[PDB]
Amino acid sequence: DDVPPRIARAMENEEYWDFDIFELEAATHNRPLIYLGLKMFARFGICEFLHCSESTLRSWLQIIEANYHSSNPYHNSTHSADVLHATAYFLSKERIKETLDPIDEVAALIAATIHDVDHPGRTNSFLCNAGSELAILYNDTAVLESHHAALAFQLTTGDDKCNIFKNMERNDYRTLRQGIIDMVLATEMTKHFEHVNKFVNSINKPLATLEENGETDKNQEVINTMLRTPENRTLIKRMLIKCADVSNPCRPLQYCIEWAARISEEYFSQTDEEKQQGLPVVMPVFDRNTCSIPKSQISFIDYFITDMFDAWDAFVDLPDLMQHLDNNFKYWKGLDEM
Ligand SMILES: CC(C)Oc1cc(Cn2cnc3c(N)nc(Cl)nc32)cc(OCC(F)F)c1
Ligand SMILES: [Mg+2]
Ligand SMILES: [Zn+2]
């Protein structure tokens, strides 16, 4: 379609992992999700599955991207575009093609687009302690994560032109709705170790056991049967959206550092607001006046990222991501210089 040249060049090598998302951000004028969305939805053929026009998809991507806050350093349209790029990369790998169905691919790419819609640059704990409208609305239980999915479906189905699910069947939409909701809710922080351990115990450990008896067609069909079940497909979806969300430590060094600055700046603004209003300081280490960003990223990678992407790597085979992870980890160590 008639896209401008810089934005067209910015989306040149979108199938590759090494991708300049900030050049696309700069080119699109903080509209990376609509341009990258139209291409990624067309490549997979999502409107052919959903039975929507291109005009419906443009209106859908605009109203959602509009509700992403530009004022937030990290949690904005450019993050979800990078998370959409991470999702599309994992779907394009052979393990995920063989395992997941086309309905899961549509559920994954839609979930990534909406997963932080109307993020206020503030955590769940902030809104619970502050007594926010959403914290009261969702009863201190997945305050942001429930609001993201809910508002997304309010904006989609509430308007006629925005609704991309209008021509679906009753059964197909119900499954896809439950798929997207689950993947959006899976990104909440407190269920990290629940969703990671389930992926190890139900997929990786059984798959490691099944690999002992050669590479026979009888054993390969049992691996095909075991992975493709509805329960295991859900656990892969929960793991894929979680890895796609926090893929920034496994990006190229230039992009990794930029994501680290934005998330840190966002937490410093929260900590300044927590002290000013007199709220309890839930994230004490993330203060601009005391935080070491290199050391904090090392702590962040060790706690959450290292074990998660190790499990995800064994399943999918991601030598580029783990090579970047090692390169970025060694960089943060090198910045001490004392
Ligand atoms: C306490 C706080 C730092 O914990 C977090 C923060 C985040 C959000 N987040 C996303 N990219 C991040 C990054 N590069 N550094 C930091 Cl410090 N937090 C990041 C995700 C997460 O876990 C992954 C999933 F559970 F959400 C856990
Ligand atoms: Mg989130
Ligand atoms: Zn996110």
- Alpha-carbon distance 246 to 58, whole Å? 27
> Is residue 22 within 6 Å of ligand 1 at its C-beta?
no
Query: By the 8 A CB rule, do 214 and 156 touch?
Result: no
76, 79, 270, 292, 297 from 287: Cα distances, Å: 21, 22, 9, 9, 14
Question: Using CA atoms, how far apart are residues 208 and 105, in angstroms rounded to an integer?
Answer: 25
Query: How far is it, in rounded angstroms, from Cα 159 to Cα 242?
Result: 30
> Measured from the CB, is residue 263 less than 6 Å from ligand 1?
yes
What separation in angstroms does the CA of 70 have from each of 36, 78, 208, 239?
17, 9, 44, 28
Residue 155 CA, chain-centre distance (Å), reads 20
Query: Measuring from atom 23 of ligand 1, which residue has the nearest CA?
Result: 189
Look up residue 69 and give its amino acid. H
Q: What contacts 121, CB < 8 A, 6 or more positions away? A: 69, 71, 72, 73, 74, 75, 266, 269, 270
Per the structure block, which two tokens stand in for 204? Answer: 């990786």
CA distances from 83 to 160, 253, 272 (A): 27, 17, 28
Residue 333 makes CB contacts below 8 A (sequence gap 6+) with: 294, 298
Cα separation, 108 vs 183, in Å, equals: 7
- Alpha-carbon span 19 to 11, nearest angstrom: 8
Three-class SS string for the chain?
CCCCHHHHHHCCCCCCCCCCHHHHHHHHCCCHHHHHHHHHHHHHCHHHHHCCCHHHHHHHHHHHHHHCCCCCCCCCHHHHHHHHHHHHHHHHCHHHHHHCCHHHHHHHHHHHHHCCCCCCCCCHHHHHHHCCHHHHHCCCCCHHHHHHHHHHHHHHHHCCCCCCCCCCCHHHHHHHHHHHHHHHHCCCHHHHHHHHHHHHHHHHHHHHHHCCCCCCHHHHHHHHHHHCCHHHHHHHHHHHHHHHHCCHHHCCHHHHHHHHHHHHHHHHHHHHHHHHHCCCCCCCCCCCCCCCHHHHHHHHHHHHHHHHHHHHHHHHCCHHHHHHHHHHHHHHHHCCCC
Point out the residues that are catalytic: 75
Atom of ligand 1 nearest to the CA of 260: 14
8 A C-beta contact, residue 216 and residue 275:
no
Q: How far is CA 118 from the centre of its chain?
A: 15
- Whole-number Å distance, alpha carbon 208 to ligand 3 midpoint, is 31
CA distance 248 to 255: 7
Residues whose CB falls within 8 Å of the CB of residue 11, separated by 6 or more in sequence, listed in order: 3, 24, 35, 36, 39
Q: Could you tell me which residues come within 8 angstroms of residue 200 by beta carbon, excluding any fewer than 6 positions away?
A: 311
Q: Which atom of ligand 1 is nearest to the CA of 249?
A: 14
Q: What angle do CA 39, 43, 46 make, to 5 degrees?
A: 95
Q: Which experimental approach was used here? A: X-ray
Cβ contacts of 197 within 8 Å, gap of 6 or more: none
- Reading the block at residue 292, the tokens are 């070491």
Ligand lying closest to the C-alpha of residue 191: 1
Residue pair 145/127 in contact by the 8 Å Cβ criterion: no
Tell me which ligand sits closest to the C-alpha of residue 266: 1
Residues with Cβ within 8 Å of 304's Cβ and at least 6 positions away in sequence, in order, are 192, 246
Assigned token pair, 101: 């169905």
CA of 145 to the centre of ligand 2 (A): 6
Residue 201 identity (one-letter amino acid):
N
Residue type at 175? T
Residue-wise burial string across 235-255, b where 16 or more C-beta atoms lie within 10 A, e elsewhere:
bbbbbbbbbbbbbbbbbeeeb
Is residue 195 lining ligand 1, measured as CB closer than 6 Å?
no
Which residue, judged by its Cα, is nearest atom 11 of ligand 1?
Answer: 246
Q: Ligand 1 mean position to 300 CA, how many Å?
A: 7
Q: 321-328 long-range CB contacts below 8 Å, 24 or more apart? A: 321/17, 321/247, 321/250, 322/250, 324/17, 324/249, 324/250, 324/251, 324/252, 324/253, 324/256, 325/249, 325/250, 325/301, 327/253, 328/249, 328/250, 328/251, 328/253, 328/256, 328/301
For ligand 1, atom 2, the nearest C-alpha belongs to 300
Nearest to 178 by CA among 246, 106, 229: 106
Both ends of the chain: CA-CA distance in Å? 53
Alpha carbon 268 to its chain's center = 22
